[model samples]
Target: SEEALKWGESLEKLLVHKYGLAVFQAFLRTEFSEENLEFWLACEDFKKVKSQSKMASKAKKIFAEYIAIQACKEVNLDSYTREHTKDNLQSVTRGCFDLAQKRIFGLMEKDSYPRFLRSDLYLDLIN
Candidate 1:
């Protein structure tokens, strides 16, 4: 409806700022796609995982939760990227999911991020 397109004209501004990422996270939750955002956060956290064992453990949980097929909550990723994720799990580095994370970020930037600003929740916040 109109709400999803209310602030559609300036979608860029709403998505490029730090505040933009925060509110967008809320919108993602409302849509039950919050796992995408959380997965990104997990990657950032995983970056700090220097312990080989810990890194391996957390990485697996992350994959199982949001990347593994039929995980707790899987993120939408191309099969190619998904396979790369499978490979990265063996190495378990912080940047292991860089490609996948970028894909998710782009997906949100192109999709969810805009509708949010146009959402009644967002419009109400502004007015």
Candidate 2:
């Protein structure tokens, strides 16, 4: 697990590279000095974050809540009360946690790079 966290560090590198590329592309038609480029790139990098263990754990918990909501498609105020009788929501929550962990590890193993300014990965980002 610690190894996984170490590998996750590369995610920061991927983000910096992607952000640098975007800034360069956007300013391609304009005249920009190396200092200006580095300044903007550094600013962008500052906005990016390295995933933390606590954040990742919180994300998994949040996703588990989402999975519970999805499983109980009914619109009852006490959806959990109704669904708990029919299905094992607790078990499903556990399953969601496992799935989330697998996905986080999968991203690291696949060397999946994230795009700048995209929120699609937000679901997996914190995790």
Candidate 3:
């Protein structure tokens, strides 16, 4: 939760700027988990879908695009997390992806943050 968010405080500004995400996405591409970041962003956008009747549809789109078993860039997750998301999708809400998002947040914070910090793109931006 808060601890995960804390890991990203140093790089929050990059999330705000368009170019930072693109650069980071490319870096993540090489690391083989760009979908986590993509899905993370989709989660933020998905939260704003105001149509009550559309939650299920939006949820499906979100899942198919990122979390499904065969999603183009399906994020690698533990069975428990995957099954938990499968159950939650049946009653889709803005936070349907919360578990997955948190998992990704933890992954990126631990697995990708340091790389991003030293990533040529990050270094170039700083310079």
Candidate 4:
């Protein structure tokens, strides 16, 4: 049981880091204009999350949720466009299910992204 918990915790931590990367990358693609990117090229906030620390878990959850929503819509649109109908209902449904899981767990504060290192909920869950 302890080992299982360890595995789950490790997996969650990994996912969090992955999602933080996604968020940072998305911001690079969206938030950072050419001038801003050039000006802030050396800023640490834009840096990728490192594997050593368990930070950015909240960012990961938010990123996962953001990606899941986008993916679900894209999958549906691609299916409909390709087949001109509901031929790939199973695949579409799976996407929807995955999105639901991400959304359910990716909740943040009313007006902010999840800041795992600064969040009480994150600390409670991780610990």
Candidate 5:
């Protein structure tokens, strides 16, 4: 189905498509950059926290896993955004990681998404 390439139209479209995300995740594995998408997914879930205590807990987990200076699963983030996010960790607001999440989103869309669209994995599926 030509539908595989449709995910290239926008990051939102790709993520919203259930199968698209799994395929994209697999595609990312080929490049050894799955951490970015995993981090973004973590942020998406983190935003849905209704309990204050859980919000704080999840926020710390996200930062420790993906935003810390030398986190094993650290996603690519600019120093300003990373430092700013680090500063806000103490308060643990729902949107605490919004900026960093957005930055990572932008990186995937502007950088990885294009490559994904052009990859053999995407093209082969279309055929």
Candidate 6:
């Protein structure tokens, strides 16, 4: 119950916890904003790549999957960030997705995170 309650305190706290992320993902799905969470998770994983080859490969995958204008699972990135991400692709680095990732994270924290807190999906977890 306390763990569930703590999710309301901050988006950082909620995202770092395993179950919190799972529940949040579920919540985002219902809100039809799952791509935002998916993009954030992809960026987190992208930052951990040890092989330069893999980093470059993963950067393209992420951009095509989530950053492309008509990507199947595109998140709500602004045009500037979208173009900025494309520029970063010219030199693939662990930070290539940093701007897009942070933007998506902020969107969730401000929009969906509050909704999740009040959701029956979340409230039921406490019970």
User: Which candidate ranks first by lDDT, i.e. highest?
Assistant: 6
Task: Report the CA-based lDDT of candidate 5 relative to the real structure.
Answer: 0.89
Show where candidate 2 strays beyond 4 Å.
1-61, 64-88, 91-96, 113-127
* Candidate with the larger lDDT of 3 and 4: 3
Candidate closer to the true structure by lDDT (higher is better), 1 or 6: 6
Candidate 4 accuracy as TM-score: 0.18
Tens-digit lDDT track for model 5 on 43-83? 99999989989999899999999998789997889889998
Badly placed stretches (over 4 Å) of model 6 are none
Q: Candidate 3: global Cα-lDDT?
A: 0.77
Better of 5 and 6 by TM-score: 6
Candidates sorted on TM-score, descending:
6, 5, 3, 1, 2, 4
Q: Give the range of the ten consecutive residues with the poorest summed lDDT in model 5.
A: 1-10
lDDT by residue for model 4 over 50-112, one digit each (tens)?
432322442333223322335322221233233322232222322222332333223321112
| Ranking of all candidate structures by their lDDT, best first | 6, 5, 1, 3, 2, 4
Clashing residue pairs, candidate 3? none
- Predicted structure 1: clash tally: 1
Q: Give each model's whole-structure lDDT.
A: 0.77, 0.34, 0.77, 0.30, 0.89, 0.90
Off by over 4 Å in 4: 4-92, 108-127
lDDT (Cα, 0-100) at 66 in candidate 3: 81
lDDT of 1 by residue, 29-64 (tens): 999988887787787788788798998999888888
TM-score of 2: 0.21
Which of the two candidates, 2 or 4, achieves a greater TM-score against the reference? 2
Considering lDDT, which of the candidate structures 1 and 4 is the better prediction for this target?
1
Question: Which has the higher lDDT value, candidate number 1 or candidate number 5?
Answer: 5
Candidate 6, residues 1-127, lDDT tens digits: the string is 8798878779988878898999899989997999999889899899999999999999999999999988999889899999999999989988798889899999998899989989998999787
Models, CA RMSD each: 5.0, 16.0, 5.1, 17.7, 1.3, 1.1
